[PDB]
Recover the amino acids of this structure.
RNA sequence: GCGGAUUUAGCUCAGUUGGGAGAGCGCCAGACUGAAGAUCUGGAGGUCCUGUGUUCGAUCCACAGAAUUCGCACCA
RNA sequence: GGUUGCGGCCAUAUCUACCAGAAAGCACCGUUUCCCGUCCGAUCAACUGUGUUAAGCUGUAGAGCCGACAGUAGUGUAGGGUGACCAUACGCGAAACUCAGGUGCUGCAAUCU
RNA sequence: CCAGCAUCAGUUUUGGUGGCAGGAUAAACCCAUAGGAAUGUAGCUUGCCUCGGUAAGUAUUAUAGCCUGUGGGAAUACUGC
RNA sequence: ACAAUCGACCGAUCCUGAUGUCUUCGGAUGGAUUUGAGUAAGAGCAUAGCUGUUGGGACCCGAAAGAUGGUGAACUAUGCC
RNA sequence: GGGCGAAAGACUAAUCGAACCAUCUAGUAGCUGGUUCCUGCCGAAGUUUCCCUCAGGAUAGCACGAAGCUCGUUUUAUGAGGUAAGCAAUGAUUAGAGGUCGGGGUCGAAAGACCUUGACCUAUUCUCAAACUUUAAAUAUGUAAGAAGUCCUUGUUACUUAAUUGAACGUGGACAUUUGAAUGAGAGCUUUUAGUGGGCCAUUUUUGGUAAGCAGAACUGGCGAUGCGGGAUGAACCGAACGUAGAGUUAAGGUGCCGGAAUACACGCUCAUCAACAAAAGGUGUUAGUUCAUCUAGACAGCCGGACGGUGGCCAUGGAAGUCGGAAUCCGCUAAGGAGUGUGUAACAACUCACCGGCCGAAUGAACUAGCCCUGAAAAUGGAUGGCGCCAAGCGUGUUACCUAUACUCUACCGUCAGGGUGCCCUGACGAGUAGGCAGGCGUGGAGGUCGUGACGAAGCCUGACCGUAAGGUCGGGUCGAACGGC
RNA sequence: CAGCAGGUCUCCAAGGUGAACAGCCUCUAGUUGAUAGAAUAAUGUGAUAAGGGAAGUCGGCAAAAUAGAUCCGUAACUUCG
RNA sequence: CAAAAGUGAUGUUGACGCAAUGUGAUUUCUGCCCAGUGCUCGAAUGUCAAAGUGAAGAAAUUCAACCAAGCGCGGGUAAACGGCGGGAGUAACUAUGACUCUCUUAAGGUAGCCAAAUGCCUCGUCAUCUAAUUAGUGACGCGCAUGAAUGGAUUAACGAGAUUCCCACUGUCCCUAUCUACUAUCUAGCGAAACCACAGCCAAGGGAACGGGCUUGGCAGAAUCAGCGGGGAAAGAAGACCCU
RNA sequence: UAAGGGGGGCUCAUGGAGAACAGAAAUCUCCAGUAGAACAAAAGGGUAAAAGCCCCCUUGAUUUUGAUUUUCGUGUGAAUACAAACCAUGAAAGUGUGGCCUAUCGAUCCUUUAGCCUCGAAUUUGAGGCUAGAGGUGCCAGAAAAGUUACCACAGGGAUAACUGGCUUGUGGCAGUCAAGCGUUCAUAGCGACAUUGCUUUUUGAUUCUUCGAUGUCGGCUCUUCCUAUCAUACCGAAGCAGAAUUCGGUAAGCGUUGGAUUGUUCACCCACUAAUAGGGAACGUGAGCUGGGUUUAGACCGUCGUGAGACAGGUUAGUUUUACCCUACUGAUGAAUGUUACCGCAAUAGUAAUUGAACUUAGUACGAGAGGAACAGUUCAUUCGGAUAAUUGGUUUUUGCGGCU
């Protein structure tokens, strides 16, 4: 499984706190970054990395894009004039099959029967309209996140359409 | 389908159809010895399986239950 | 002209600020041997005192609540295209957003005018 | 005896060519006249620089857009012959 | 047991529109009520014959296997001298 | 099941873990295989309640066979999503700030006092959920009712009922008529003698691995039991229905050529043989539209200069020098040089210039949007991304001509049955086909019958003619030396 | 089963060479089978040889050293055979 | 131990023996256990098979239902089968646990030996050998899980049985050649064998799924004999895996 | 057995506000709020008119029934008016066959008992058919009670598997590359946080799609192909490289690509050289050419597990390679077609051959601190292959001659 094979979803929803026999740990370090304070305060300009598609942005790549852009935005300042968000969470626990095997095995591990994707990963859904990487950035001079949206969509499956918001 | 043994102080058990119970090992504290052992003293530790009766009086006798243990018969 | 009851009936029938009326009719004021009840006067009781009370109404817009014109997504029966989607036959077409609006409806019973 | 297929003479059904017309309509292959708005080409004159051209006047050489008024043209979707 | 009384149902009765025939009888259909009555309402038995099947030479074919009675120590395991 | 063992069930007529021969015996096989005329009428199903039940079968779903009869198109409503859309409620987290108490710091013997980073609330700012839903379609569907004729008054009797409700009869009114002839089904119910009881694929959505054909639930078409055309090869798709034939007209789709039909017409980017997969990420091929900086107020390029005085401006620092970091932000000479575009030495030492100067004299350049191109792209038998090969014989947009399904379509003919009236004729609707049933037709051995034919030549052998519904039988020739059919 | 490369009790004992009954070789004494000729590939069936001395192959498998008579000379340790 | 029973083997053997089982000559020796189970032995003491209530007169007859053993309980015995511990603390100094405490059970092992026909961990750890050498041979301790009678241990002779070093050496190979016997080639005679798919190119393409056989394209003539092991998959039996 | 019926009375959990007390509070209270508390046991669900709180007395855990309907094919089950039976409660109205909606068990066979309708001259009685109850048949719709199974026989089965081919690339490899970091300054001499997109089919497997009248294994010998994801040979360019040592990239598949030791063995792991010792697929040519060490049964033993016969995802000892290629691939040799034809040359075409090092010698020159020692010539030969190969080599030569023993 590369993130080529963490693209779409015939994995249907499954995400509540009541009905769950415990989720694994995530990678996710921080949501809002640069400014914590200013959402639309200092920043009347935004770029949204709006999805064309209805994909699962897996928690693997979710931290990846965000941490590349974290390390990058220290040169300009470690709290420069941007506001890189994480939005929609891994609420849904990503079900992934295997260890599997029909005959000739330890106990037999099935696949077909034993259809339950035995909980391995975590993934967020980033459907149409939705974004994770909302970048509220400054009006004049230092806009830095247009560049840092190549670095956002790279660590993301799919072909996201860049919309000025 | 029908009968026998056992239940007592923590643990090991002594011992009993009416005047109402007994010692070791252990536990503690003080003597004692050059010290540990040994042993006395003092502290104690149970209403003798349990519910309810009989009697002047009950561990003890009665009706009935809990529970460990043991045997024959079953239909063939 | 009014007062009281029975409602049917639930969120356009909901709440606050604040005013105002008294014996046709209503409600507070105040207290108890003995029945009757207890923790306690919650059964029962004169002339009078009085709007405290509660049902009700006026004054009132602060809020529940509410609305054109207009703008618009999906889509059966089908019919045209695309990798992670987009666009059409043909029949209908919202919230969001707004000119603006707003103090119920209806039937029945008793009594005075 | 059905199908293919049959002398010789006359006729139907269905569609088109070509010639012509009605419903109903007037643009045209291309159609008059008067007044006002416009502005293209040829020829002449004048001015200025330069050897190659350009600007202004030219209704007084010749001709037009678009509108208004008056007057006159006008064969065809459909449908039939 | 009589019978009273209810039921599948037969037969009667009543009504709608068309309706032969008339202000009088007669024919048929659909639905419903009322009312009278009978049969285990199955209202004959026998027979040539047919059907699918239980059974019957049992559609044709492919096995491992039991009980009973014979014959083999001619070869061969063992015995003895 | 005994004989026998130092063991290996070695051994016993090639058979020994129970000798061999014969009989009962054709033991039996819940499993598998094989299995004999034709046409016509006509023809499904792979689904289920349920089982010590599973390659089966009682029952049910669906059409067998036979007799007697059986729609809807759509109008009025009534019941049910929460798709839609959302964060009220509940669920999971991102933001500003406000601020009790708590926590930290400091002065204090513990005790006491002074400050301050984190709270609900709440205002402002912003994320968001299969067991989370305030509001709540078109469109399909149920259930009831209607388009296709029933409503209402008065009086009496019996039940219910001691009131009253509900119904039928008596009785009045509302509610259509002339003329001629006569009754339609595309759906219900009953019942004898079979079959299925194991299927495939395409479209679409769900739970679910969108890594995979993992695996399950809903809904729909064709095949199963279907002609023919299209597609190089391929049941499902497209067009679509078939008994039997030639015409009349055209679908789905084709016309440079193998192989029939334009080397056509008009306009156009592009000519790479594009046509023939592919993202991040990127480009002076090449064209168009829109907006704007910019322009005789001298756009822009090349070539050519002034590289100035204050001055090493100031300050990071060991040193900082325009040339480290950071701020002031000028004066100068007021037709230009900023307190600076790029290079260079630790650095000076050295060098170049946007800013800007001087020649020249017209449309140039940034964005923004669209199209053709173009870069990213590796594997083993002989073209291998077409055979010949095509630069238009590619492709878009607009047009025209030619070709095109047993369907479409003309008319006749073949199959059973109905009605009118026998003898049967008119004539409706349909006719691809496997199980299966019924009907009809051809069939052997044999026979009650048996006459007829025969030795002047019977069956047979062999060979020819040889009707037409698929089934197989009459006549005729060469020849036989006794058998066999009218009815 | 066989006109089959077979099973099959069991008798007799010369010369010289080598213990005997190995081998060697003649007697008394016997005999070459129910098809044949000529050449004599590839390939399967026999021996020889330079140089090397284990280097090769599952594989000292295969193949090599040596050998008699008579005399000399010779190892641990014993259940002391 | 055979046989239905008669009748015998065992056996005219007899404990100096007969037989089932365990076993193996030689030579030095043999520590310890009664929970669980069998065999054998023993008597203090507990249980299991032979009643009698009811019908003759308007309500007043008759006969069918407890006692013994093994067992319970107690005693003998392991050449019949079986059994032989955990947690915690502790010595100069890296480093270790003599000894001690505590829990648990019926109660916790000697003489002698070790990395196995048995070792997860392990190219463990060390010496010597080898062009590399883990074998040869030298030990290490880090025993997943050694231990005295269906026996440890002393210890000579013998083998178509099992490894290595060492000496001479070897067609096995390097390295193949040459010559020879017999046949193949070729011929005569008589005369087999199980044995009967229309058919017999390759590259690309579709596909009952790896085609000479089907779609296109390239290629493909016949009379005849000797050769050689690649496919089709020969000669054949209803597969060896695998499930009913 | 009240943890039921009926009457009568009441509205919370909880918070704020403190009160001597207080420990949150105990008890209480003013003030505010109202189905969020309470629910056998789970989840949903009902509910203030109370299904919650509070107090007393009652015994319906009820007889005899059922119109009209639920409704499964069935077995089997529910709603169920209404009337009588009929006791104690209430002023009466009043509503229920014990229950807030909301899982909670056993037949035929049987067993034994109570209630009491049908019988052999015939007075009794034997024998036999409603109903209700005993009894962990949990699969809730139910036969005392345990099995290895390999000497081996027979009939069937991808109804079912080892495993093959297909598919994806799961598990993952490679590259582009987002490029912040860090290497002396310094995103890319080099090193690369964090990882992803396309390709791909190698680590390593997901899947019963396609297969039981055969789908026989591994390392090597031998001989029959094609490609380059490139070790070496031809040709080129660049560096943070002084010549030269060192470091990196492009054009391009004709040819060359070792010898031994550890280990079954490529892997694992070491050595001696040599100019030096590559990558990938192809039924890895590959058991009717070949070995049968690696690799599907059968003597016997140990460890480990089970009452045991015996077993094991653990090891050890012996234990079947038969035969003549039908058709084709295919390598040699002959026979016949535009008169004929002994004899041989065009090249429209088919098959083929292949490599490297050292030495003489270039040169002691280029260039350098020092070790060192480049461009480029002419000349010769040694490993190795094929064809040619018969003399100076090495050997064989049964043909024809020579030595010894019975």
């Amino acid at each position: 499984r590369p993130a080529r094979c963490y693209r779409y979803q015939k994995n249907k929803p499954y995400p509540k706190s009541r009905y769950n026999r415990a989720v694994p740990d995530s990678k996710i370090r921080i949501y809002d970054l640069g400014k914590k304070k200013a959402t639309v305060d200092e920043f009347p300009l935004c770029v949204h990395l709006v999805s064309n598609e209805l994909e699962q942005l897996s928690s693997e790549a979710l931290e990846a894009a965000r941490i590349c852009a974290n390390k990058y935005m220290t040169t300009v300042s470690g709290r420069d004039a941007f506001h890189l968000r994480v939005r929609v969470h891994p609420f849904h626990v990503l079900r992934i099959n295997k260890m599997l095997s029909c005959a000739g095995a330890d106990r037999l591990q099935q696949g077909m029967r034993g259809a339950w994707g035995k909980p391995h990963g975590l993934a967020a859904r980033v459907d149409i309209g939705q974004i994770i990487f909302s970048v509220r950035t400054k009006d004049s001079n230092k806009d830095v996140v247009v560049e840092g949206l190549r670095r956002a969509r790279y660590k993301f499956p799919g072909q996201q359409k860049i919309i000025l918001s």
